[PDB]
Amino acid sequence: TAGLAVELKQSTAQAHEKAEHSTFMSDLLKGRLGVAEFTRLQEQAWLFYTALEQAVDAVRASGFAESLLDPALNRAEVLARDLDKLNGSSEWRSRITASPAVIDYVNRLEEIRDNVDGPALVAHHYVRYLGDLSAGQVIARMMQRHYGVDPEALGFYHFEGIAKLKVYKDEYREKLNNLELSDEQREHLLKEATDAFVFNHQVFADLGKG
Ligand code: COH
Ligand SMILES: [Cl-]
């Protein structure tokens, strides 16, 4: 009754805290790593965003939650543009390989794609895109300040088509509240949001491990 958006934020709050406190992300954001480690992160993100956006496309094409699944949110192509700049070459696409965590995350996203699992997809959409909308300005500024990354290579963190980010985030949360879901679908979505945070935490863990 608080609304699905508020339940999601409460349910995932601890997982969000654990992700912020992960050693790799904490070290990266504090300036203790470098542009190389930042670029390795963006490469792994390109892999899972590519899979996520295949799943989004399939669910949108099935007619589920179409207005929530705004294609302007797509991050895979802008990540590739950033990586072409960061690596000074397009050849990173033929050099990178998924970490074990990314393999697992991509496997889940491909099952969601194949099953056209709308509620599961919405959970992953919330976990990635609402986080991106919330954190992009602060993370981009940290990469620029600590590592000298030019804003031209921080496009992943920017949504130039969204004139008022807060208005958009509030509208996005209201679209979540407005979804019509059965009790099973709602519980499935909430459980998948927890799983989505775990997948993302493990991407950071793998990056920290090397
Ligand atoms: C720059 C620090 C930082 C990091 C490392 C970080 C790491 C991650 C991460 C990595 C696993 C994921 C999946 C997310 C996902 C989210 N983050 Co952040 N977030 C971060 C800064 C924020 C900020 C700031 C907000 C808005 C306030 C809040 O809810 O915490 C945020 C909010 C979110 C929200 C929206 C909550 C809501 O309003 O319902 C999601 C989803 N997230 N975040
Ligand atoms: Cl894209």
User: What's the CATH number where 84 sits?
Assistant: 1.20.910.10
Cα gap 138→161, rounded to integer Å? 18
Domain assignment of residue 170, given as a range: 4-209
Which residue from 33, 39, 34 is spatially nearest to 89, judged by alpha carbons?
39
Sorted by sequence, the CB contacts under 8 Å of residue 94 that are 6+ apart come out as: none
For the chain, how many structural domains are there in total? 1
Cα gap 79→97, rounded to integer Å? 16
Cα dihedral: 121, 127, 133, 139 (round 10)? -140
CB 82 within 8 A of CB 154: yes
Cα gap 27→68, rounded to integer Å? 33
Ligand nearest to the Cα of 129, by number: 1
13 lines ligand 1 (CB under 6 A): no
Cα gap 53→63, rounded to integer Å? 15
Ligand 1 atom 7: residue of nearest CA: 20
Pocket-testing residue among 16, 32, 48, 137, ligand 1, by greatest number of atoms within 8 A of Cβ = 16
Cα gap 76→46, rounded to integer Å? 6
Cα gap 133→77, rounded to integer Å? 17
